[PDB]
Design a protein around this ligand. Structure first.
Ligand code: M7X
Ligand code: M7X
Lengths: 304, 304
């Protein structure tokens, strides 16, 4: 037992990290097969970032201007192309460390691991959730651009995120591996509105199920609620409305603990209305929304 | 910016994980060079675990009884020996994936990453602190025994922990890589007292410095304190007494923020005496003690 904000093992992703330099800018790239993916802002200087004309900036670049280094070895660039906000650098050597992989666009409220990198070198790994407003509350410094988010299904790495930018608010924005930004963000140094965020209700309920499985049961009560009643409380407390699809995904946890989903909603309703009264749940003094129902089951059953 | 409970990249440790089976028991082993380290309880059955006579149990085992599998390949065992609570299985092949490594015995209050494994396969990675009472609040299920804790200094992996047991209280106990338990624990299915735990004061102060660096400054006040005054408050709130050595290790963070260590102690004193008033610090509603001063600097400077 015990419950931690656990990341996937990063080994398969560490083997894909490279450093990409173009002019004076250095960032991280992802080397899969004979292609290196990196944020397209690698071609900009500071004077360009206010409103870059990426098409024009890229036209002044040739394959030999993109310096790609995989630790000790330099990679030979034989092609370059911009796809949305990512650059794809064709190299003459397939990465021998390429794992089985997929490019996926994750949904808001879903979680993933991030391997934070600087100069093509991994520094650490942590678990994130894509906020309902398509930002991520990461830990990234200058040079972290090109670090990726991923999930792992035994031997398959599904890459879902590539880091691009830190907004003035200190929150993070990036793209799927086809270079499409999550959220309304654009890759330019401009103040940009992140929408109203909400708490991922299905994740808080999954985490309450994790708490019950792991021995923390003080919040369980004699009450029940309905989806409609629960949603009036969710509305007031800026939580995502709960749907039958969320109840359905909570099925396994409801069965394991014998606590009906609406009964757990009534515990969440009381905790929202009353707070924690200075108590903790799984070492947290707030309601945690960064664990999905799948995450809770995976952590509580031991999937490798 | 941003601050996360970040683990070291696990790649170098994933390459050392093997499955060790002896009779009916399967657990994880660590393969470094031509030796596989695993908890000695791999030789026990359920009937033995109340009070195993490890010397006698091991005498009934021969090299061929220890089945070591590194993914697909079976390793040939040519020697076995018990050192404290670990078994060292000499194999005929040096692990080609052996990183540069050291075996270190960490101090209480220090942090490390754990690569949780089942059947020699990694499932996830998380950051832990060794509690002042020598337990760890991990996330481990049956079969996780043999999973290790480590720190990484660029290319060198310092292994500090090997998981052995979950105490009846749901907390975890294990050994250094020489098989010496951290704390008073013994490897037997018996109720065992973990000492009175305390909060790692130097870590909470380091985390308050991380909060200031990352923009969360609401807790900063117009006050200061002395070590003696601060320690009277630490005593009442079950926090470790602060010493000049702890102040000295906080030097870099004090210099970066310009906030003298005793002034930060006065903010911690007010937060202990008043609580958070329903506010948060770095997304937490409690005082976090799992980041050391080194961790904060490493995360805030981008070390790879
Ligand atoms: C401190 C920090 C954290 N993460 C990323 C960064 N880097 C950036 O934001 C650079 C940038 C500026 C303008 C637009 C774009 Cl797409 C990129 C810094
Ligand atoms: C649920 C779980 C988590 N971690 C480890 C375990 N495993 C054990 O404790 C087994 C055991 C029993 C008695 C003494 C020893 Cl040294 C080992 C289970």
């Amino acid at each position: 037992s015990g419950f931690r904000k656990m990341a996937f093992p990063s080994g398969k992703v560490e083997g894909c990290m490279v450093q990409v330099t173009c002019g004076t800018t250095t960032l991280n790239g992802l080397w899969l097969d004979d292609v290196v993916y990196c944020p397209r802002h690698v071609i900009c200087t500071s004077e360009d970032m206010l409103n870059p004309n990426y098409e024009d900036l890229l036209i002044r670049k040739s394959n030999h201007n993109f310096l790609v280094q995989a630790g000790n070895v330099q990679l030979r660039v034989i092609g370059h192309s911009m796809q949305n906000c990512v650059l794809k650098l064709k190299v003459d050597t397939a990465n021998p460390k390429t794992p089985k992989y997929k490019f996926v666009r994750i949904q808001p409220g879903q979680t993933f691991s991030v391997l934070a990198c600087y100069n093509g070198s991994p520094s650490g790994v942590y678990q994130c959730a894509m906020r309902p407003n398509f930002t991520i509350k990461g830990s990234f410094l200058n040079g972290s651009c090109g670090s990726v988010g991923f999930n792992i299904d035994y031997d398959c790495v599904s890459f879902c995120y590539m880091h691009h930018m830190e907004l003035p608010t200190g929150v993070h924005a990036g793209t799927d591996l086809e270079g499409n930004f999550y959220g309304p963000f654009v890759d330019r140094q401009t103040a940009q509105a992140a929408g109203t965020d909400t708490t991922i209700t299905v994740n808080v309920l999954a985490w309450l199920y994790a708490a019950v499985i792991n021995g923390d049961r003080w919040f369980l009560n004699r009450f029940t609620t309905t989806l409609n009643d629960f949603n009036l409380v969710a509305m007031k407390y800026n939580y995502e409305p709960l749907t039958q699809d969320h109840v359905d995904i909570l099925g396994p946890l409801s069965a394991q603990t014998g606590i009906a989903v609406l009964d757990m909603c009534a515990s969440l309703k009381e905790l929202l209305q009353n707070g924690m009264n200075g108590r903790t749940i799984l070492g947290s003094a707030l309601l945690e929304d960064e664990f999905t129902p799948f995450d809770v089951v995976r952590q509580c059953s031991g999937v490798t």
